[PDB]
Ligand binder design. Sequence first.
Ligand code: MET
Length: 515
Amino acid sequence: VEKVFFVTSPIYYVNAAPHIGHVYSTLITDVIGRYHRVKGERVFALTGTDEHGQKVAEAAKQKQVSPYDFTTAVAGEFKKCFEQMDYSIDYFIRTTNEQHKAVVKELWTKLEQKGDIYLGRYEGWYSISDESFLTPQNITDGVDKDGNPCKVSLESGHVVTWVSEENYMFRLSAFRERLLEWYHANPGCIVPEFRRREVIRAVEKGLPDLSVSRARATLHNWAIPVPGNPDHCVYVWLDALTNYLTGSRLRVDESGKEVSLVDDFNELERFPADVHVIGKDILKFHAIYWPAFLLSAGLPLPKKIVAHGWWTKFDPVEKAEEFGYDALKYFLLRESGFSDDGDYSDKNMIARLNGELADTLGNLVMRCTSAKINVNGEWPSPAAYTEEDESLIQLIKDLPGTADHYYLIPDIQKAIIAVFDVLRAINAYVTDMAPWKLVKTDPERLRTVLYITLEGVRVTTLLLSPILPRKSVVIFDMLGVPEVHRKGIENFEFGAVPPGTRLGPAVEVLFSKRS
Ligand code: MET
């Protein structure tokens, strides 16, 4: 199928202000989106806020404001944050939106008509902070915000409470075999692989039915009513997960306001998601519940769920103002793969800013554009190639395919490492050929050295443009790369910018080192 590449972040609870967690998740969503745009594909990237439920209403009660005022305010803080971080998200969704609620009711009704929702009881533990049902084996002893003796979640260490309610139940138990078929048939559907193994183990152990409504009193009436039963409200997670479906059905104008909700998801060619970006703490909701609902409704399943090492639930805008926006994005994407084992100190931030961005990339951009070395201020025409020239060229030609596979996994840290390996190689080659000497001794040779250098800088910069969107534009301007050559798989190929291309005007640092 030729469809719109549909990439999502989770929608974030509005009990608290935006923070690094949310910023991180949306950054990954943004980068994936950007990579596919650079590739030349149609892209719809989605982010947003999760505004209903017990947790949000209780956060609004603490602040002595109405849930409507509170959620609207906090949503605005998330919107301002994501504008400031310089993302390129196509739409920001809110679960308070009327069109979203329509879709929730449609979906609810569909599940009901298939006999997959019945009236039942849930008697068990529940974390209000995670909005998660827990069995007794996922709880242990602990303390609260004061220090009294209570029970807590093994998942998250938040306080749990016993709940005994008549609830609408979804027949999740009936989807165990079909979920297991899905996991085995599509062995890259959950990334990384060890989290895929976690999910499969859990589903193999057995699946209880899932409570999908709560009594309206318990939610402080801050929730979507169940169709044809106003004493019950729809479970915040069914309401939340459905944002992806809603998003896939909203037509959106040139300034990002929703204007129309289509009946059939196929009209916009977005659903199902190609990638759901999530934190590790919401894996079960996305890999177990969400597909079970979709199977029940006869809707298509997402292709990939990528679960990163961070939790979903250190001020980024402050650090971006201190070290640069692109540099901060580079650091977060480079420093952490799929575990929490990463060093986010100012020491390490500066180490990578100076080491990799300034000395490796920045230096190299200045070398191939400086008037000392590139005297004609143009892309020269190469002479014949030595075997050492060819070895570097081979690396540059192989890089797009290698990075493409990493971005598609998706493993953004590995994509960056691949590019920088080539950058290190190019630097080694330059040091070796010493082109500063060649301006005097051997002009014919310098043409070849300089051309290869420029073209390596271009190709690496193209593949880095989803990570450093602003700086990539600065680099391409210095190199004098025409706009048409700054995207499209065509321009991943070696030799795309012809010799004779004039460099851009000089002024002037790309990344400046710090103490
Ligand atoms: C369907 S994604 C919902 C994520 C949840 N609101 C959270 O903050 O973790």
